[PDB]
């Protein structure tokens, strides 16, 4: 039931494997929480959001990625995924500003149709801090990225829909 909007919205399937959410994540833009699957205007999301994470060991570290799988349009997404943001080594119970920004936040600018803008959080392996070298934002693969950096399955994910205004 908790992952339901991600399954109906095809995030689980198109971008992520099935997982059991275990960390609470709250993504907010100017204090307005992102609600799974609801539409936002691009102008509302032009600056990076606040991403607070909750619960679990204070010693844990988390990686956040933001991706758009529907590029340039969802019907023929031949550039998928477009990478919007990567923050690693976020201490448990804090927020993205406490991690290492590895890929800077790129404002959502969907070209064709309605795109899903997806935030995914992973727990890092114990005693591991990571610094991914990502040469390009196009043709990004979240599943492959998690395998590369030993990030396991997502522990939380949320997304919004956005289209050109």
Q: CB neighbours (10 Å) of residue 165?
A: 8
**What torsion do the CA atoms of 48, 50, 51, 57 make, to the nearest 10 degrees?**
130
Q: Which of 149, 22, 164 is nearest to 86 (CA)?
A: 149
Distance from C-alpha of 23 to C-alpha of 151, rounded to nearest angstrom: 14
Residue with tokens 């606040």: 50
Contact of 111 with 91, CB cutoff 8 Å: no
Tokens coding 162: 């956005």
Hunting for tokens 């204090």 — which residue is that?
A: 31
Closest CA to 23 of 160, 158, 159, 161: 158
Which two three-digit tokens encode residue 63? 């990686």
- CA-to-CA distance for 44 and 159, rounded, in angstroms? 14
For the domain spanning 1-165, the CATH number is 3.90.280.10
Q: What resolution in angstroms, rounded to 1 decimal?
A: 1.8
82: three-class secondary structure by DSSP: strand
Positive or negative CA dihedral for 153, 157, 163, 165?
Answer: negative
C-alpha–C-alpha distance, residues 86 and 120, integer Å: 10
Radius of gyration of the chain (CA): 15
What are the boundaries of each domain within the chain?
1-165
Looking at the DSSP bridge assignments, the partners of residue 103 are: 86
Burial class (CB in 10 A: 0-12, 13-18, 19+), 107: exposed
Of 39, 46, 50, 48, the residue nearest 115 (C-alpha)? 39
Question: Which run of H or E residues covers position 142?
Answer: helix 142-148
Q: Work out the number of other CB atoms within 10 angstroms of the CB of residue 57.
A: 11
């Amino acid at each position: 039931r908790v992952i339901e909007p991600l399954i109906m919205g095809r995030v689980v399937g198109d971008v992520l494997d099935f997982f059991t959410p275990t960390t609470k994540m709250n993504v907010s833009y100017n204090k307005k929480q992102v609600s799974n699957g609801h539409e936002l205007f691009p102008s509302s999301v032009s600056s990076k959001p606040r991403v607070e994470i909750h619960g679990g060991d204070l010693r844990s570290f988390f990686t956040l990625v933001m991706i758009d799988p529907d590029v340039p349009g969802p019907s023929d997404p031949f550039l998928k995924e477009h990478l919007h943001w990567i923050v690693t080594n976020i201490p448990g119970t804090t927020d993205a500003t406490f991690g290492k920004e590895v890929v800077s936040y790129e404002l959502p600018r969907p070209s064709i149709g309605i795109h899903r803008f997806v935030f995914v959080l992973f727990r890092q392996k114990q005693r591991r801090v990571i610094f991914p070298n990502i040469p390009s934002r196009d043709h990004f693969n979240t599943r492959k990225f998690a395998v590369e950096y030993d990030l396991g399955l997502p522990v939380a994910a949320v997304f919004f829909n956005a289209q050109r205004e």
